[PDB]
């Protein structure tokens, strides 16, 4: 690891400042230096190591809709051969998607989720799991996209298990973890049904519980059970 | 695109 | 060169893609490549490489200024120490930055330069040369600063003449040249009195050519009036 | 900042 000579205190200070500067590569390798110290990562700490990796892995999965667009097109009727050109540059770009995804696993699987014991924590690694497991099976076509889809589906359950047993329904993980698990339903397992149910009885028991909170808290979660609506206002 | 976090 | 082993079409294919993926990082590499290929570059080749590298140099330059903020704070009186990690950081994105600089300069002397021998490639890439050494000019601090800027400054100066001796005052790389020379008078060299004079000159002189053009190539030229206008407005 | 392009 070429971050193995730099303080873990150093990196977090230098992914702070890569955030500031909008250098979201940089702000990932220092958060990725960072977990391999091998201590547990704070709450603060992991949410830049998500904010690095979703920036990173964002901007990928944007410019492979843009290329896998093109290339679609230029695989219909009456379509003008254009050679491998565009076949090749999206398979780089799949494969360099692919590569952050695993990196990603590979830090949650050594070692973050087996010692992550506290509910906020370890639902909050299990939501990273779910995530990078879904972005795989955005690109997925061959004999393990079901494999992929069923390793998304499994660590989205476990964290909605822990989720509803250990959080308030107004906790932010536990909303932004249903908010995905939703759209892993709509958008990866063909089961818009379950996707709409999950967003509305999450909106619905968030609501609930609102009354329980300060105003800072009750700005947190209310921001995201916005986009649960969103997302029902899209699909109903 | 849906949102998520 | 990783790509050597491709052909020259295909590499401006996916440079055309990565820019509609906005992948810019890549389209520059595969314009080097391009160029590597020793063959002369038409306009539109031409300009696949001026973008590719714009956006890459630009994101570096916003990074360095939000750091060097940082660092500049950090050095006020009633400060408190953080420690060596903004300086090292803004370090790190400065020599990235010279490292694009030097690979695009690098091109322009081997060997675009030499063989480009008609006014619109000739003045297209020592406006490049003049803007690359500005890059540079922009973070120098040590014995060569005043050689760096005093390349930028020989760079602009040829592509000036050639300019005025060989295109109309409308000519939109002719227009965008005084631009950039006017920002390096005003910014770099600190001579805001020249800088303010070359974009009104600029700015009038082409003024009094709109009528020779036909609607499409107004257009090009009034957008960049507008931008020497612009300027002015700011500094006057 | 100024325009350039
Ligand atoms: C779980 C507790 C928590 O959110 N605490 C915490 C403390 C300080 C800063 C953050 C935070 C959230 S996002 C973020 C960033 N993008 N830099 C920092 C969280
Ligand atoms: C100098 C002649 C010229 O501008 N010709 C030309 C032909 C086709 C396409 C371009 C062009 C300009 S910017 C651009 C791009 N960003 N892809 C392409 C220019
Ligand atoms: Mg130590
Ligand atoms: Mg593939
Ligand atoms: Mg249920
Ligand atoms: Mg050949
Ligand atoms: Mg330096
Ligand atoms: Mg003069």
């Known amino acids: 690891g070429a971050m193995g000579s730099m303080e873990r205190a150093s990196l977090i200070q230098k992914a702070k400042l890569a955030e500031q500067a909008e250098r979201y590569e940089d702000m990932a390798a220092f958060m990725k230096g960072a977990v391999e110290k091998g201590e547990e990562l704070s709450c603060e700490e992991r949410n830049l190591l998500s904010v690095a990796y979703k920036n990173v892995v964002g901007g990928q999965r944007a410019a492979w809709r843009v290329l896998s667009s093109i290339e679609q097109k230029s695989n219909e009727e009456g379509s003008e051969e254009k050679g491998p050109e565009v076949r090749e540059y999206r398979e780089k770009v799949e494969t360099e998607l692919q590569g952050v995804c695993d990196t990603v696993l590979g830090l949650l699987d050594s070692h973050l989720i087996k010692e992550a014991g506290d509910a906020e924590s370890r639902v909050f690694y299990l939501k990273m799991k779910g995530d990078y497991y879904r972005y795989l099976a955005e690109v997925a076509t061959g004999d393990d996209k079901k494999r992929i889809i069923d390793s998304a589906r499994s660590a989205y359950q476990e964290a909605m298990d822990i989720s509803k047993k250990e959080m308030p329904p107004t906790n932010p993980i536990r909303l932004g973890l249903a908010l995905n698990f939703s759209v892993f339903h709509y958008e990866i397992a063909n089961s818009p049904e379950e996707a709409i149910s999950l967003a509305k009885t999450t909106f619905d028991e968030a609501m609930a519980d609102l009354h329980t909170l300060s105003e800072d808290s009750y700005k947190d979660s209310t921001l995201i059970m916005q986009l649960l609506r969103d997302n029902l206002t899209l699909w109903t | ?5």
Do not use: D, E, H, S
Not at chain 2, 1 to 5: E, L, M, N, W
């Open chain 2, 1 to 5: 695109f849906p949102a998520t976090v």
